[PDB]
Amino acid sequence: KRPTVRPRSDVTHKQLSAFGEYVAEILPKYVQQVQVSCLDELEICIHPDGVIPTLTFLRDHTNAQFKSLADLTAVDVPTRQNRFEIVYNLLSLRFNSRIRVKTYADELTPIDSIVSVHIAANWYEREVWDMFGVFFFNHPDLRRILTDYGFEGHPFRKDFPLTGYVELRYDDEVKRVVAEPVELAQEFRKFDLNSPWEAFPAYRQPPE
Amino acid sequence: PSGEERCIACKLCEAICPAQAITIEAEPRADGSRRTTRYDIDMTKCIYCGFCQEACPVDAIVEGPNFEFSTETHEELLYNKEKLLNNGDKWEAEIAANIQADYLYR
Amino acid sequence: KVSPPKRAEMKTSMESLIHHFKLYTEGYQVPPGATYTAIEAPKGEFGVYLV
Amino acid sequence: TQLITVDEKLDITTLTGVPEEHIKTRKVRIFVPARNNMQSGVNNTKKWKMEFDTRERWENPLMGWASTADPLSNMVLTFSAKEDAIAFAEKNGWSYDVEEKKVPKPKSKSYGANFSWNKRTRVSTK
Amino acid sequence: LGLREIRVHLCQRSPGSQGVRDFIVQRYVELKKAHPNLPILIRECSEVQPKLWARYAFGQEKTVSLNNLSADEVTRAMQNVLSG
Amino acid sequence: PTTNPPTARKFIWTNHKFNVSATPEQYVPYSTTRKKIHEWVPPSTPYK
Amino acid sequence: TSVKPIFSRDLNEAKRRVRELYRAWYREVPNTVHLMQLDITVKQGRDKVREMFMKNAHVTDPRVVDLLVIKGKMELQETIKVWKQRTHVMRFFHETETPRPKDFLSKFYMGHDP
Amino acid sequence: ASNLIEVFVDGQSVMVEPGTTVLQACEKVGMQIPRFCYHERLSVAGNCRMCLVEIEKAPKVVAACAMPVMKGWNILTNSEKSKKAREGVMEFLLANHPLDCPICDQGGECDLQDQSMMFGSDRSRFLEGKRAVEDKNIGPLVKTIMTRCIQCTRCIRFASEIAGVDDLGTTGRGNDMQVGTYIEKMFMSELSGNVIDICPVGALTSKPYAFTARPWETRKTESIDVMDAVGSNIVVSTRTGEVMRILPRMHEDINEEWISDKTRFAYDGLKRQRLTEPMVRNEKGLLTYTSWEDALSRVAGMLQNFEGNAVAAIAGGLVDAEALVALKDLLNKVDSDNLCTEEIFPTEGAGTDLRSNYLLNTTIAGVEEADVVLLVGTNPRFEAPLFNARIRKSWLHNDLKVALIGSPVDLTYRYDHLGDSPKILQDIASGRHSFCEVLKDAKKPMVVLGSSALQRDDGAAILVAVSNMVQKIRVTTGVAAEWKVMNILHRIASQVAALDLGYKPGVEAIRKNPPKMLFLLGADGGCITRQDLPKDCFIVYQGHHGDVGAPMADVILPGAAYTEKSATYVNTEGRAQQTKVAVTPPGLAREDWKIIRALSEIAGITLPYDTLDQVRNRLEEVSPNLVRYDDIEETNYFQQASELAKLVNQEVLADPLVPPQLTIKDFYMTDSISRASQTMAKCVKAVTEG
Amino acid sequence: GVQVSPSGEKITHTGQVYDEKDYRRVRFVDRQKEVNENFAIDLIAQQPVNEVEHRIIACDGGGGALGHPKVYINLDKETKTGTCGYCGLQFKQHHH
Numbered sequence A: 001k002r003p004t005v006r007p008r009s010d011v012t013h014k015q016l017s018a019f020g021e022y023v024a025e026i027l028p029k030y031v032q033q034v035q036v037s038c039l040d041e042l043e044i045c046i047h048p049d050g051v052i053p054t055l056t057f058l059r060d061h062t063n064a065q066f067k068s069l070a071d072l073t074a075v076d077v078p079t080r081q082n083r084f085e086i087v088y089n090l091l092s093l094r095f096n097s098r099i100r101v102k103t104y105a106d107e108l109t110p111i112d113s114i115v116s117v118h119i120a121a122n123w124y125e126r127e128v129w130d131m132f133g134v135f136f137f138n139h140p141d142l143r144r145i146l147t148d149y150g151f152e153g154h155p156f157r158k159d160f161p162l163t164g165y166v167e168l169r170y171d172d173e174v175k176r177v178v179a180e181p182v183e184l185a186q187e188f189r190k191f192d193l194n195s196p197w198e199a200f201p202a203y204r205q206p207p208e
Numbered sequence B: 001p002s003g004e005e006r007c008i009a010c011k012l013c014e015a016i017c018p019a020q021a022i023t024i025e026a027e028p029r030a031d032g033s034r035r036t037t038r039y040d041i042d043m044t045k046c047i048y049c050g051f052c053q054e055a056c057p058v059d060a061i062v063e064g065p066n067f068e069f070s071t072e073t074h075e076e077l078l079y080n081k082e083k084l085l086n087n088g089d090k091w092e093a094e095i096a097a098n099i100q101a102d103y104l105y106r
Numbered sequence C: 001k002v003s004p005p006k007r008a009e010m011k012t013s014m015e016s017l018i019h020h021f022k023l024y025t026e027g028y029q030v031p032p033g034a035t036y037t038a039i040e041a042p043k044g045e046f047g048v049y050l051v
Numbered sequence D: 001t002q003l004i005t006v007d008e009k010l011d012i013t014t015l016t017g018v019p020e021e022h023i024k025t026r027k028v029r030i031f032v033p034a035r036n037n038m039q040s041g042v043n044n045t046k047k048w049k050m051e052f053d054t055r056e057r058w059e060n061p062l063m064g065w066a067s068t069a070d071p072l073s074n075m076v077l078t079f080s081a082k083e084d085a086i087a088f089a090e091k092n093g094w095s096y097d098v099e100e101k102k103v104p105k106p107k108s109k110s111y112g113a114n115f116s117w118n119k120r121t122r123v124s125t126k
Numbered sequence E: 001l002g003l004r005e006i007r008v009h010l011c012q013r014s015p016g017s018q019g020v021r022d023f024i025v026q027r028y029v030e031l032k033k034a035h036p037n038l039p040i041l042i043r044e045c046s047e048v049q050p051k052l053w054a055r056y057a058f059g060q061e062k063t064v065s066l067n068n069l070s071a072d073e074v075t076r077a078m079q080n081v082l083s084g
Numbered sequence F: 001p002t003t004n005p006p007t008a009r010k011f012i013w014t015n016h017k018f019n020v021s022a023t024p025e026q027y028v029p030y031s032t033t034r035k036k037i038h039e040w041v042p043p044s045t046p047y048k
Numbered sequence G: 001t002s003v004k005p006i007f008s009r010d011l012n013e014a015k016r017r018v019r020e021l022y023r024a025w026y027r028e029v030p031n032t033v034h035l036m037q038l039d040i041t042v043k044q045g046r047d048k049v050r051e052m053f054m055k056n057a058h059v060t061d062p063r064v065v066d067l068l069v070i071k072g073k074m075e076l077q078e079t080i081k082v083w084k085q086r087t088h089v090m091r092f093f094h095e096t097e098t099p100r101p102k103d104f105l106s107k108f109y110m111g112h113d114p
Numbered sequence H: 001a002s003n004l005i006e007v008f009v010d011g012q013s014v015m016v017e018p019g020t021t022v023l024q025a026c027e028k029v030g031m032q033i034p035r036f037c038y039h040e041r042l043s044v045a046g047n048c049r050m051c052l053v054e055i056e057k058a059p060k061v062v063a064a065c066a067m068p069v070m071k072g073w074n075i076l077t078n079s080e081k082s083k084k085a086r087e088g089v090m091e092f093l094l095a096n097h098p099l100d101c102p103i104c105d106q107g108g109e110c111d112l113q114d115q116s117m118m119f120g121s122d123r124s125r126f127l128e129g130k131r132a133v134e135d136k137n138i139g140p141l142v143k144t145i146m147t148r149c150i151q152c153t154r155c156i157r158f159a160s161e162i163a164g165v166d167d168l169g170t171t172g173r174g175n176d177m178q179v180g181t182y183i184e185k186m187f188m189s190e191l192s193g194n195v196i197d198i199c200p201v202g203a204l205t206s207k208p209y210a211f212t213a214r215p216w217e218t219r220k221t222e223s224i225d226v227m228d229a230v231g232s233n234i235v236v237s238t239r240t241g242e243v244m245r246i247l248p249r250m251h252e253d254i255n256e257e258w259i260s261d262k263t264r265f266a267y268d269g270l271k272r273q274r275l276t277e278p279m280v281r282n283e284k285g286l287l288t289y290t291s292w293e294d295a296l297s298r299v300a301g302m303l304q305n306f307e308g309n310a311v312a313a314i315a316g317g318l319v320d321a322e323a324l325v326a327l328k329d330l331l332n333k334v335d336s337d338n339l340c341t342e343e344i345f346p347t348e349g350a351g352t353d354l355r356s357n358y359l360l361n362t363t364i365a366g367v368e369e370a371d372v373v374l375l376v377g378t379n380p381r382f383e384a385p386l387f388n389a390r391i392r393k394s395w396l397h398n399d400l401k402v403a404l405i406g407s408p409v410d411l412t413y414r415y416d417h418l419g420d421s422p423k424i425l426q427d428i429a430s431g432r433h434s435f436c437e438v439l440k441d442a443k444k445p446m447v448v449l450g451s452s453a454l455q456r457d458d459g460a461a462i463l464v465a466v467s468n469m470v471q472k473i474r475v476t477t478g479v480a481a482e483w484k485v486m487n488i489l490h491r492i493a494s495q496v497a498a499l500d501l502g503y504k505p506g507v508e509a510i511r512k513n514p515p516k517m518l519f520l521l522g523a524d525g526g527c528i529t530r531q532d533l534p535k536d537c538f539i540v541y542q543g544h545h546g547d548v549g550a551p552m553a554d555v556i557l558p559g560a561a562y563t564e565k566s567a568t569y570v571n572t573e574g575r576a577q578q579t580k581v582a583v584t585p586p587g588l589a590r591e592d593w594k595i596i597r598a599l600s601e602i603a604g605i606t607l608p609y610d611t612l613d614q615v616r617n618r619l620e621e622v623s624p625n626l627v628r629y630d631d632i633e634e635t636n637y638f639q640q641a642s643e644l645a646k647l648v649n650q651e652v653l654a655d656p657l658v659p660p661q662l663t664i665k666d667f668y669m670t671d672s673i674s675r676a677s678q679t680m681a682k683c684v685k686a687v688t689e690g
Numbered sequence I: 001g002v003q004v005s006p007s008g009e010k011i012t013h014t015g016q017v018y019d020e021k022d023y024r025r026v027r028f029v030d031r032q033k034e035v036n037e038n039f040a041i042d043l044i045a046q047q048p049v050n051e052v053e054h055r056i057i058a059c060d061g062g063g064g065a066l067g068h069p070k071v072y073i074n075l076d077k078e079t080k081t082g083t084c085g086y087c088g089l090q091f092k093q094h095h096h
């Protein structure tokens, strides 16, 4: 009706809520939270011990058939004890659906790799380790995949600086490409682009 | 058309520049006008996206149609206000015609 | 409040000028949430997980 | 069989990859940022911020730009709680200064005080 | 050798500084009468140990911890600092 | 621009210049701002 | 104060893994110097390996020690299979980088950085 | 729930005190109602109508800034009526608001723009022509473009209630109502840049800051002001390593929301007359630039040449505690005790031994809590503008009774002028005064003695007379022991920290024993010169501005400024605060304690600290309140100090108490940064001629 | 107009010129420091004051949507022309 607002269908929300209840009652040992967004996306937040059973159940169950892992990633929220939120987006071609599975980790608690469930998880978990430092148990070959050889630090972390700590240049005395502490001719000018007025009253957190 | 600079040092182009390729410093002029004292565009940093020319409220900064301006040193692509004003004076006969042909779409 | 107004409207209207200023300096505020949007790219499924 | 005991400080500085200078010589500040006095909006005073001490910015000889040498100059981290920021700073091995949140004091407001019979709060104009 | 400065660090509300507080309120005035040229800096804080600092000629400093000392022994420590 | 000449402005260059790179007429960048911090000038007369 | 281990229950087998990694690096240094045409000697490479281990020698958390061993094994594999180049190997020596002096007078003369 | 009423914001219960407005209840719940004319420290106006909200089961929206909640009200802050009201009011403002956003200094700092984006519509229906208003010329500090004004009367209420000048107002009627002055009048008081702060639109902008930067450009550094001894918390806005602006910071116990004009606009003096390189005298006698090694070598050689009493140091006003303790340690290691300050405090009696003897013991919240205030020998309006602003706030709200001994100066409130002679202190101590019967009627008196009054020759006599008077007041009124009556108001930022560290106040020791080597730690007051110094005196000036102390120095050492160093300053209350680094010192200038420590290492007596935290540890082990930041820990022993003061046997003079700052022209230039500021020079020229 | 330093270097419209002892003139040695010849302050000083009849005038810089945002200038002060804050054109009210 309204030309500027997205149309909303409630049938997808009902179906995803029913399937979330289904998965939650099937796996109460690991499922910690089930939510359906207003964008009609199902998220299941599980304990890190249940990554392998949850992913295996979602891939091999007759009513799930999430045989395709869309992607695997991490989100660094450095204000909780377990700062890395590991996100698995999965696609079911049989039922034309998508699901999201979340779990948590910190810098010193590795989680189980799901290479035995999906083979794309090999390179995806290599990227997660390279960019966040989240180790993965039982990985066939875990190593860096995008950073330079000998790169120190995991650059997608929040506390890692945007420009990094070292920069490369060709030194003619040693006839090599060498790493120096980073100096910028012009510093990256950060901007404070946050309005002091609340934009969304639906997301107003209660005062502390 | 009077010859006064269109730029009013509002830094909208600097704010919207996705590559942070624009550096602007400003102060009131001798007649009290709000004008820039530094307008630098690092063309080695610029991504040629037109966000500056579509964020400029007075059509001061534009991407004129010159593309054959390759240089032999890295420094010559670090434009300042004198270079940009000279480019505006050089290409005004074409930029004004392009804006005349284009401005009804934007 | 999301898309910039036309340039004539910006140069003739106060609300349009304010919105042009804020969209091209701060940008629109996106309400908090996460999504995975997948699009049939020519090379396959191109996905964006936006938080 | 899957639970051990660690009675230590939870130090991950050897794993973060930060050079030793930018750990030992750095000071961080944990604070709720003050409300910008040009505005009356208070939505930027809700979250704790951790920033670093300001280092040298000099003038570029070629162009006059603000050249810098420290990488942690634009690094600002957002935390929901002061103790969370404390935990992150101690975990990453940075010395910190903590400023307590300046909540504005509750104030007794009365519109009728502008028209007082005897008190000095009576205004002379509107 | 040669006393230059006395500093007394104490607490306003602490049992360990009670003798120091008593010493100040019943003996500091006549002490200042006795030595009206010597800086006896009384500094009080919330979470400091009761302390005495004696600064001498070339920057030397002797530190005496007088936590949980009563008024008479704080007086005796002060006299030991003043004499030598 | 013979049947439709462009608009004439007094600030438009009357003589077009080609690419002047690697010539003495080339463009050299510089900071266009003045000095911001002014140093104290000591007096030229001795105190004693 | 009770956490989940990664590989080592306590510091002893963590130090055992550290000794195994040091053994592997010590054996691999001469092969690296022979294979990549390095100006350094075998003594300098083993000294650099010992310097890196002693740089990390102050940690007492078994999980951190295990992750350090994992990272060291990753770098060891990057040196065994020739993925690190001559530049990547020589980046450990910082021979083009002048060192900042550690004394107050030199830091005062150089600049404002402490 | 005694004396509390339960109200609801969007159905959520909250208990509020009676008289709480709808806006205050909503901000207690946690939501900020839009506003333009309401300010938490101004009176309620209620004219901008942006705060209109819907109360449930009520047909008419109410103004939340003025309407108090009654009982059980459900405040629907996000209902359709509230949203429509906000959209309508925003449309009415932007109908006549001028399209000036690119050329307006309120670029990203605009309440009108932000509240438009958050609550107004996205387009305009206004098809008519806009109004335009001629600009005013109220002064060279505040630039007026009154076409942008939304007639919210915030500036009028501020100038009436806090500045206390009654010079602004509205002339006209209807759509032609214009804010300003009817006559061509220069609106120049102290605390006059706060109208630039509180004007929500860019109608009242800053003329020194004009067109310079944008708020998204500016980095914010939270620091402390050192232009006086109030210690106002400020934000230094720096862009690309250059100080761009000074804004206040919200600190309820010191400066609330405002700063003085000197604090706000004297920052441009940090860009002129700056010492950038170390300098030494030639063989001709002229100062020439040299290296740090050479300059410190010369100073160290002369220092190890000279012995204890021959070496002395004098501290100025803009000096941090770290440099003060470093210089004290250096002179103590060469066995020198002549560590003096330019400002004079009486050493007779207790002196600086008891910390309550030289502090604002009641503090600024105690000014808010007091009922009678007796100001002796001070002009607080210019010596401590935020302290006087707090006095005026208490005078407005708590009906404070203010009396003044000293010359009659305009304090922007009505007081009782008891006279200017210091013998009135003896009269009040004897108990024969109309103010004596006022005081015995009073309950929580406060007696504030000025450091400017202590600067006189009979400063000790004045201090002991005031102490005797305060003792008589305490024994005749029966006040509680928790209430502090005696207070000393300082005008020097470094003075309280120096007295805590143990500096002997005043240069009387220098005059008694003229030193052969002299350190001037930012000393630019000219209290000691080469006329009363010996002929072959070696002078080293360590400072940031070359004003009075640099030209008379043999060696010049460029130090940092308060915007350039992380430093410790103690205000009049005894509260210690630290400034953070906003920019770096220009040229070869260094941090002051680092300069002193490097000099000590070259001289061969190395101080036991190398980093700033170690210097703070030294500060703690000297007097451990310079590390208790933002702490207001109480002092005692006024009885002991008063007994010693009673045994002091000096006599007051017949000269009337005349403060040095009688007018705002005397206010605008007090220290080296103010004297180097061009903006302050323009202010002086305006209040003198224009 | 373009003026030269005692060093002979052209002074820009921002007033920028290197000092005699400034080493950064070596970037102009064997090259040229290019300065925009048309000074906008002088060019806008050359414009005649527009004599209008109304108390409030509207300026958009000319060309409609090709100019600057449309603002209104109040010509009440008879001792000073009203200057457009964007384009610098001056207007004066004709009281005859």
Ligand code: SF4
Residues within 6 Å of the ligand: B013, B016, B017, B018, B019, B020, B021, B022, B041, B045, B046, B047, B048, B049, B050, B051, B052, B053
């Ligand atoms: S076109 Fe270039 S200068 Fe303009 S906004 Fe895009 S990147 Fe920046």
Ligand code: SF4
Residues within 6 Å of the ligand: B006, B007, B008, B009, B010, B011, B012, B013, B014, B024, B052, B055, B056, B057, B058, B059, B060, B061, H102
């Ligand atoms: S070029 Fe345009 S967008 Fe950039 S500062 Fe100037 S007026 Fe603003």
Ligand code: SF4
Residues within 6 Å of the ligand: C018, H097, H098, H099, H100, H101, H102, H104, H105, H106, H107, H110, H111, H112, H113, H148, H200, H201, H202, H203
């Ligand atoms: S006050 Fe605000 S809305 Fe008005 S011109 Fe300035 S930025 Fe725009």
Ligand code: SF4
Residues within 6 Å of the ligand: H148, H149, H150, H151, H152, H153, H154, H155, H156, H179, H198, H199, H200, H201, H203, H204
């Ligand atoms: S000038 Fe500013 S503060 Fe004063 S009434 Fe107008 S909008 Fe309000």
Ligand code: FES
Residues within 6 Å of the ligand: H034, H035, H036, H037, H038, H045, H046, H047, H048, H049, H050, H051, H052, H063, H064, H065, H066
């Ligand atoms: S905020 Fe209440 S009417 Fe203005």
Ligand SMILES: [K+]
Residues within 6 Å of the ligand: H106, H195, H196, H197, H198, H199, H200, H201, H202, H203, H204, H205
């Ligand atoms: K304003």
Ligand SMILES: [Zn+2]
Residues within 6 Å of the ligand: I059, I060, I061, I068, I084, I085, I086, I087, I088, I089
């Ligand atoms: Zn115009």
